[PDB]
Write a protein that binds this DNA or RNA. Structure first.
Lengths: 213, 99, 22, 62, 135
RNA sequence: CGCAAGACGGACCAGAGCGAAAGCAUUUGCCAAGAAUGUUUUCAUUAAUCAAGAACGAAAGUCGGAGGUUCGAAGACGAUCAGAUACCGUCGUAGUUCCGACCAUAAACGAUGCCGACCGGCGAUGCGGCGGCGUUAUUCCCAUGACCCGCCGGGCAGCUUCCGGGAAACCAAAGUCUUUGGGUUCCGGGGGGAGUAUGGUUGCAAAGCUGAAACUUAAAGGAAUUGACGGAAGGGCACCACC
RNA sequence: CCCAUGAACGAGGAAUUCCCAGUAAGUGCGGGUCAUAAGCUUGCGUUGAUUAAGUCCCUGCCCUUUGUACACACCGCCCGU
């Protein structure tokens, strides 16, 4: 009857200034017709893009959720919306003869963003270990989890979203936790496993403009 | 007559073990008794590895793997030939197959 | 006959018997 | 669909309910020689030359 | 009509391959996932219940999907392969590999490959009884 | 992209831990408890087993009140079958979840009472303690945490057994038994009838506990050995097989 | 044996039997039986061979392990008003 792609415009998706790569791809929407407008149709769609496609010298197992906030000049302007690890990476770090320690905090930044950071760490076998299994005791696991939560809170609640994502890009918080927990039980693969945004402040166009450079 | 000293399961010093579901039939089988296979397989089969590699946008992509933990009841594990019946003497051998 | 089913049949017999006896 | 000359290295065997296909392994001579396996039909003698009109047909084994 | 910008570069879509043991889905969509380009299943390529999940039906579906995406301007694809998941099986069906190979073989460029089958932290009861399905 | 509901707590998760057993796995906090270890602390036989009594006791089930995702007895259909109203599939009610009150039964199993002595070896593992080269982590003066090599105590297990014992299977206990006595509780006496009838007793009910006999029978049964058979696996073979 | 009097006149219900090179099949001939009695059998040549150098799917067999309440040995044994 009517070809629906003949009435569709293509749009450019832009990453925030925290990433070396700016244009992360293209996206579609039906043209503004009657009640429905194109800009509203592109205002909540989330792009999960591998970090290696965002930064040219980074790891590919880290994915960032970028959500478009507003569209001007047929460019879609995105913001940090979440971070995750690839399923294969997480499944690869879960081995059978070690303890996995997980922690999570709900911590707000200085610009009103409320985040839920998930940290995962694994017990490391020493280079001369003859014992098959390396297990942390329950109090050791509790201390490691407390250190994880404390470090995440210290690393999030004092900076705004920009510096939080800048720390996430090389996972500074995970390396800090791995360093801090070395004297309780040597940890193996410490990562901020997942970041999900619980609530955001009211939209500010100028803040988003300063965000995209 | 007692066929196995461990009664075909790996439960010592505890009363109850939580059940799981066989991946084939969905039978309720205790976790200690169930036969567990950890399959780490490439998402791209070896026949298709070269064709996917050439069509890759990124050079040196190293394709991801699949991590699936398989739980089996005794009936389905025997039928699938994951385990076989053994002699009265070879039954005691707990060493995994050298492969 | 399976012993469980023999017990079930006996229990149904007893249920009917206690139904008829008041 | 290039034409490549490859030599049979080993004959595996037959397959099917009654047996209707033959398995050999052929190695290239002028394509950065590597070992590729492929099923085959008919008299393909001991270490003959099997011609690959294509480098992607494999043998699904068992 | 389509993106005719920077002909020398790739236009990336996302192919959601749903390979259950009943049939296989070849679903190419926008980068965000909200807009869909084309979805061709193995069931609209074979007129029989059994071959719905066959590798050949998946190859046909992937060929049609790639043809439509090429005629719609998309040049490269990110792969998000999933099995049924949930409390049911986590192994992709027979058509996943053939669909992916048909996408690669028909002039499409493959990006990142990711497995996204729904995995419960723990689930509800499976459809079988406590004695399983006995056929 | 969100939103809401209940259910569950994967991977980590182990012949690993805890609990009297049933049973127990997301974080954190509170509350009370507990074993082992350490002790040149205290009391000084206060102990072991236990009729009567008592606490707890999977699942299913019952009566109220919430909740009711998923699965799902019953039921309704759809299905190759000679015949399902079975196995399979789509739905689906009580239930499955929680809060009270009942119920007191499981292949509730290690089919092995508890307490105490003695009797081989070895490698691990969990907890506590002790000793010791060295390797790693918090400013360069130390403990301590993670490893490493050991010793002691309790624990879950991995063991020949021609110590020894058993009918053997097998068991370091199922040993220390005609060379028969450490203490003590429960409990069996060929197979059926039968855990039935009856009486009592508990329960709302379902049912639970205690529990015969007449009669009937030469075996029933346990372990193992050979064969035969298997719609059991592995490896071969045959145009009286197939392709 | 001849008059040429014209018979679905050119790969076959369900079920299947035999067969791998001088197999099969066609074709005649000789022995036995006998009175030179053959449509039978036992041999012999002659023409001459499509397909397959495999498998354990059907029917079975064998060299193992395993289960058994079978040993008259699965055509077994056995449960139910």
């Amino acid at each position: 009857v009517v070809d629906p792609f003949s009435k569709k415009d293509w749009y450019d998706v832009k990453a925030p200034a925290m990433f070396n790569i700016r244009n992360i791809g293209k996206t579609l929407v039906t043209r503004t017709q009657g009640t429905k407008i194109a800009s509203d149709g592109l205002k909540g769609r989330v792009f999960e893009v591998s970090l290696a496609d965002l930064q040219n010298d980074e790891v590919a197992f880290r994915k960032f959720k970028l959500i478009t906030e507003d569209v001007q000049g047929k460019n879609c302007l995105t913001n940090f919306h979440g971070m995750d690890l690839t399923r294969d990476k997480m499944c690869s770090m879960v081995k059978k003869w070690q303890t996995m320690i997980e922690a999570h905090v709900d911590v707000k930044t200085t610009d009103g963003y409320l985040l839920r950071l998930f940290c995962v760490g694994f017990t490391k076998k020493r280079n001369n270990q003859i014992r098959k299994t390396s297990y942390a005791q329950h109090q050791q696991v509790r201390q490691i989890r407390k250190k994880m939560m404390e470090i995440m809170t210290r690393e999030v609640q004092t900076n705004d979203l920009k510096e939080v994502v800048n720390k996430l890009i090389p996972d500074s918080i995970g390396k800090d936790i791995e360093k801090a927990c070395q004297s309780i039980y040597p940890l193996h693969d410490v990562f901020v496993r997942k970041v999900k945004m619980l609530k955001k402040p009211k939209f500010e166009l100028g803040k988003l403009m300063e965000l995209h450079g | 007559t007692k066929k196995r000293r461990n009664n075909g399961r790996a439960k010592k010093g505890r009363g109850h073990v939580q059940p799981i579901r066989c991946t084939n039939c969905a039978r309720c089988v205790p976790k200690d008794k169930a036969i567990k296979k950890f399959v780490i397989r490439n998402i791209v089969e070896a026949a298709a590895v070269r064709d996917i590699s050439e069509a890759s946008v990124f050079d040196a992509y190293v394709l991801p793997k699949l991590y699936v933990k398989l739980h089996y009841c005794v009936s389905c594990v025997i039928h699938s030939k994951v385990v076989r019946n053994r002699s009265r003497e070879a039954r005691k051998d707990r060493t995994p197959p050298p492969r | 006959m399976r012993a469980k089913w023999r017990k079930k049949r006996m229990r149904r017999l007893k249920r009917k018997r206690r139904k008829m006896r008041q | 669909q290039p034409i490549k000359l490859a030599r049979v290295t080993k004959v595996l065997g037959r397959t099917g309910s009654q047996g209707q296909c033959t398995q050999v392994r052929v190695e290239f001579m002028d394509d950065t020689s590597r070992s590729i396996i492929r099923n085959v039909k008919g008299p393909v003698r001991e270490g003959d030359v099997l011609t690959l009109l294509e480098s992607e047909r494999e043998a699904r084994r068992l | 009509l389509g993106p005719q910008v920077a002909e020398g570069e790739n236009v990336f879509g996302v192919c959601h391959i749903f390979a259950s043991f009943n049939d296989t889905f070849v679903h190419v969509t926008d980068l965000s996932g909200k807009e869909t380009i084309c979805r061709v299943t193995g069931g609209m390529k074979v007129k029989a219940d059994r071959d719905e999940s066959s590798p050949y039906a998946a190859m046909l579906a992937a060929q049609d999907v790639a043809q439509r995406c090429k005629e719609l301007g998309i040049t490269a694809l990110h792969i998000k392969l999933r099995a049924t998941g949930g409390n049911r099986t986590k192994t992709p069906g027979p058509g996943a590999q053939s669909a992916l190979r048909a996408l690669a073989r028909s002039g499409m460029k493959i990006g990142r490959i990711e497995d996204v089958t729904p995995i419960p932290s723990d689930s509800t009861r499976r459809k079988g009884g406590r004695r399983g399905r006995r056929l």
